[PDB]
Amino acid sequence: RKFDSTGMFHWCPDRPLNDCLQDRSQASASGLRNHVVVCLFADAASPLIGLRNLVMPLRASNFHYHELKPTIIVGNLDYLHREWKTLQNFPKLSILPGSPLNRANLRAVNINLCDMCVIVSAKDRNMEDPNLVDKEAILCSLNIKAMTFDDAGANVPLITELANDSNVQFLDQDDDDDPDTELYMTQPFACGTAFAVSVLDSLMSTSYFNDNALTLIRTLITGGATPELEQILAEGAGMRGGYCSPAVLANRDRCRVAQISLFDGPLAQFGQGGHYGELFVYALRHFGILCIGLYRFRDTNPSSKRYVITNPPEDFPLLPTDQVYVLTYK
């Protein structure tokens, strides 16, 4: 396998977009499963969102090549040519041209078999009134939930970027919506189905009060980008890579965030009526697995939705259906 010059990401030599371009026939002929679908809304002239930053963490050299999730971008082809210059060095990446609102595109890309659908708008985020600004993101989300694959609908996992945080109320049903709750309290955000820029602006004050802690987030969130990699890109030559030395390949053995289930395997004994404190100590001792929180079903009985629980108390009761967020080294 090949990597970038700092050995942090998997890499390809430069290639033209039509090597990665697919028709609906080609996309549906491909065995797409456990993939990431990027539903991209863009005009050909609209500003670059930098899909490099979405794809690059999914290509961290932390992973084996066989466990890299393949990625398909569904969107405007003239826009994608413009970004392609930055994307062309990543493996297991393809493009289906045309609107993400079209159901034949979503079925051709096996939307029901993906591990994540990412709904993002590159359009200006300022057009018309504050209701219209999220029209495609809301309609795409609702359109995906309304489909059936009986030939599963709301069982497919979505993450939606919102231009106006107030539009979060339209993303789901039986939320009991209020206009005056902050975004972070709303059910779609608590479930991890929604995101917005407004949750990030405290990174000004955290960057001031502890610089080191901002590097902690980024090592994780970028999948391991570095000042060296940022400088190599700022040199304007594009992402240089190739075969690499055993000395730089040592950077593959680094920590990553993972999510694991208490339903089965050695930790299932804790899902069967144990407590979070027991699980934490056991997983740290036996595996070096450091637990940081829970992802729990909202309702217990019929919906698929789950919610985050950052760092529970030690006497917090577990369920066999719980999943736990973990820092992990292999």
């Binding site: 809301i138 309609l139 309304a146 049903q173 939320d175």
Partner: protein
């Protein structure tokens, strides 16, 4: 896009409210058909102006002037002559005073064929019967002798007012409506 966001908002607040929405473009109707809680079987309904407009016009290509007949039939108007009105305008305007209505056919229609029920409504009641909702249920327009009127059949009528069409619901047993001076039809059928 604004009107679709309004339906999304209304149905996010409560899914089961009947929403009737006016749309200007037919391709935008696909977006609200894909809303998770939109259902035509509850009577959620998109009145697409472009779909209707061009379909009324297409109908005049098949039957010249039918756009005018059918468009006049779907707004409430009442006739009202004037001395300045030429005789062709009095005929036209008398026609504009009629619009589409729905009523339950009386028990006297039960087990007639549709053609017999239409003859009866016209020749006696002065009412033009177009169609019937056949029991799930389906709308049948001018169906042949092979269909009977059931009990409690909804019929579709052309008449000057709803209170005129109510003759088809009040319509007596034949014993109580032989005289046919139609203002005399009233609920005292038995």
């Amino acid at each position: 896009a604004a009107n679709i966001m309004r339906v999304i908002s209304i149905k996010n607040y409560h899914s089961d409210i009947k929403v009737i929405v006016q749309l200007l473009q037919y391709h935008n109707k696909a977006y609200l058909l894909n809303i998770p809680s939109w259902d035509w079987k509850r009577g959620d309904d998109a009145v697409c102006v472009a779909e209707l407009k061009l379909g009324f016009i297409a109908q005049s290509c098949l039957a010249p002037g039918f756009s005018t007949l059918m468009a006049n039939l779907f707004t409430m108007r009442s006739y009202k002559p004037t001395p300045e009105m030429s005789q062709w305008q009095t005929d036209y305007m008398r026609g504009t005073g009629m619009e589409m209505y729905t009523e339950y056919l009386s028990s006297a229609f039960n087990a007639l064929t549709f053609p017999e029920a239409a003859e009866l409504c016209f020749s006696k009641l002065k009412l033009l019967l177009l169609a019937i909702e056949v029991r799930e249920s389906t709308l049948a327009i001018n169906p042949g002798p092979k269909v009977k009127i059931e009990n409690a059949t909804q019929g579709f009528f052309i008449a000057e007012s709803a209170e005129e069409v109510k003759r088809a619901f009040y319509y007596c047993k034949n014993c109580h409506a032989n005289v046919s001076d139609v203002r005399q039809i009233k609920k005292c059928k038995c």
